[PDB]
Amino acid sequence: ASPAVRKAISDAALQYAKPEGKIFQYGTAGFRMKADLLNTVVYAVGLLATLRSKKLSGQWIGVMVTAAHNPAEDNGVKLVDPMGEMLEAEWEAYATKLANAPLENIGDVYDELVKEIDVSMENPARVVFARDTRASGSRLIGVLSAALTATEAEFIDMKFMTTPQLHYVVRCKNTLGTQYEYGEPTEQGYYEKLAAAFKRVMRGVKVKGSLTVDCANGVGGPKLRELIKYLPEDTGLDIKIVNDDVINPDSLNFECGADYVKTKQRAPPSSKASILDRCASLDGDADRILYYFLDEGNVFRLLDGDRIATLAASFIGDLARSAGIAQKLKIGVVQTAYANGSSTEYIEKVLKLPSVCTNTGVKHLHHAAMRFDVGVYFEANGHGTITFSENALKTIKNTEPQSPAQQRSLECLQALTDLINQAVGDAISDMLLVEAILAHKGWTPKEWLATYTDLPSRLVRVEVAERSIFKAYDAERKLESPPGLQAKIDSLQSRYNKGRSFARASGTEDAVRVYAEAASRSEADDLATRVANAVRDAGTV
Ligand SMILES: O=P([O-])(O)O[C@H]1O[C@H](COP(=O)(O)O)[C@@H](O)[C@H](O)[C@H]1O
Ligand SMILES: [Cl-]
Ligand SMILES: [Cl-]
């Protein structure tokens, strides 16, 4: 790196101060913490984004400033690689080295990195960024801008966007004018693509009943309202938006949003939904969705990420069979350990498909899903998508089927591949997917719920002094450490019918998570509470 660059790096860093004693870690999805801790971190990330882009011969790299499901006082920064995927895993160590460098030395760490990565410093760097509605985002975008200006990257501020909009923009700008061309790299282009794909998938069917979408008082509320202006007119889809208060920042994810619904297993307390109204909740950056409704008995029923995965795997399997291509589109379902055991059992015994369990975090699920022609992957919390391999897409595009029924199914599959946000999932595209599926099957939430019955389950968020002593393995289902704790968990889970519990450190918040399921409500709650007390005791010595 040039002497003027190395100077502008140290000059710009002078404006900030590292918080004393904090060690930063990349975590499940990127640096995330209380927003007053973030300046030097974000500055470090601007440096890393420049290096990444240069290493990739000036391809657009994205930065999304968000803490996603986290409470409003947090923020964070996620890196996006050129095709929309999460920043390559090996590069999380480089980010963490820059973020932990004394500020005085950040210039030297930068040069140390150019040598180690072997980066051609004459390559252009091109970075595009956006943020959700969080109060700290503008300050952090200032810092990011300061880093990128110092390193002389070309950069574009896309203002407020959902996480998946930013991933979409990155993929578009890196594919524009090629055979791979994903769309126009603007917010309008995103709405146009979703709308056009949904029109095609919907040919010949209609949605029945309204959909009431809790938008977590985040950026998804205004963007979904905008998307609705683009959507086709006679599909029967009737969306009502609730919780779109992007004006009061304390409202974000507050008593509403997918994370509230999933962890508490209840509708937002401000919900005005009637019995049998079909509902869904997005989260604060619109990258999770779940569904839920009040049944005929006025009882809340949850349709979470694994319900979406299984819904999509069933539909795709029926379309591939109908299109005469079942033998050529092998479907697999990727899960994590948070998936309800009943959903795993359904995938195995009713859909008759392979499933794979991976670590928590979309990067891991996406990785495992590459092993299938069609890889359906969701986390229970409502992240996820469906990936189609090169060979699958070629089969879907080029098959010429014998009859009109087969052609209609083939065309529905082709449209689905344009609707489904490839790589990292997109909650709003997943919502249109679910709507299209129910419309084709003719199902209401009643029939979808009846596919399988979830085991009663429970999440407990446990605060400990030192979550780094909780080290997990086997798709994070067992604790290697602290010594003796897995033994206790194995012993506890065996006392309950269908008892299954595991504990692991969160990589997005300072807590340990406990999950438990069993055959009955009393058993699952007892198992979760006894496991959480064993964790709290261990983590708090
Ligand atoms: O907040 P988001 O929507 O970015 O979600 C992030 O955190 C979730 C919880 O991770 P953990 O249990 O380590 O805290 C993960 O399941 C998810 O893949 C990740 O992208
Ligand atoms: Cl907004
Ligand atoms: Cl939890």
Residue numbers in the entry: 2 to 542
Task: Pull verbatim passages from the article behind this deposition.
N-acetylphosphoglucosamine mutase (AGM1) catalyzes the interconversion of N-acetylglucosamine-6-phosphate (GlcNAc-6P) to N-acetylglucosamine-1-phosphate (GlcNAc-1P) in eukaryotes. This enzyme is a member of the α-d-phosphohexomutase superfamily of enzymes that catalyze intramolecular phosphoryl transfer on a range of phosphosugar substrates. The reaction catalyzed by AGM1 is the third step in the biosynthesis of UDP-GlcNAc from fructose-6-phosphate in the hexosamine pathway. Previously, AGM1 was shown to be an essential gene in the human fungal pathogen Aspergillus fumigatus and has been proposed as a drug target.
As expected, steady-state kinetics reveal that mutating Ser69 to alanine completely abolishes enzyme activity. Once it was clarified that Ser69 was the only residue being phosphorylated during catalysis, we exploited this catalytically impaired mutant to trap the bisphosphorylated intermediate that has been proposed for this class of phosphomutase. The protein was crystallized with Glc-1,6-bisP and the structure was refined to 1.9 Å resolution with a single protein molecule in the asymmetric unit. The overall structure of AfAGM1_S69A–Glc-1,6-bisP complex shows a closed conformation, compared with the open/semi-open conformations exhibited by the two monomers in the AfAGM1–GlcNAc-6P–Mg+2 complex. However, the inactive AfAGM1_S69A mutant–Glc-1,6-bisphosphate complex has an overall structure with a closed active site and represents the reaction intermediate with Glc-1,6-bisphosphate buried in the active pocket. The complete closure of the active site is achieved by the establishment of extensive hydrogen bond interactions between the reaction intermediate Glc-1,6-bisphosphate and the protein. In addition, the 1-phosphate group establishes hydrogen bond interactions with R33, H70, R289 and a water molecule, the 6-phosphate group makes hydrogen bond interactions with T29, R505, S507, T509, R514 and the backbone of G508, and the 3-OH and 4-OH groups of the sugar make hydrogen bond interactions with E380 and the backbone of V363. Thus, extensive hydrogen bond interactions are established with residues from all the domains resulting in a closed conformation. This provides a snapshot of the reaction either immediately after phosphoryl transfer to form the intermediate or before the second phosphoryl transfer to re-phosphorylate the enzyme. Although the inactive AfAGM1_S69A mutant–Glc-1,6-bisphosphate complex was crystallized in the presence of 10 mM MgCl2, the structure reveals the absence of this metal and the presence of a water molecule instead.
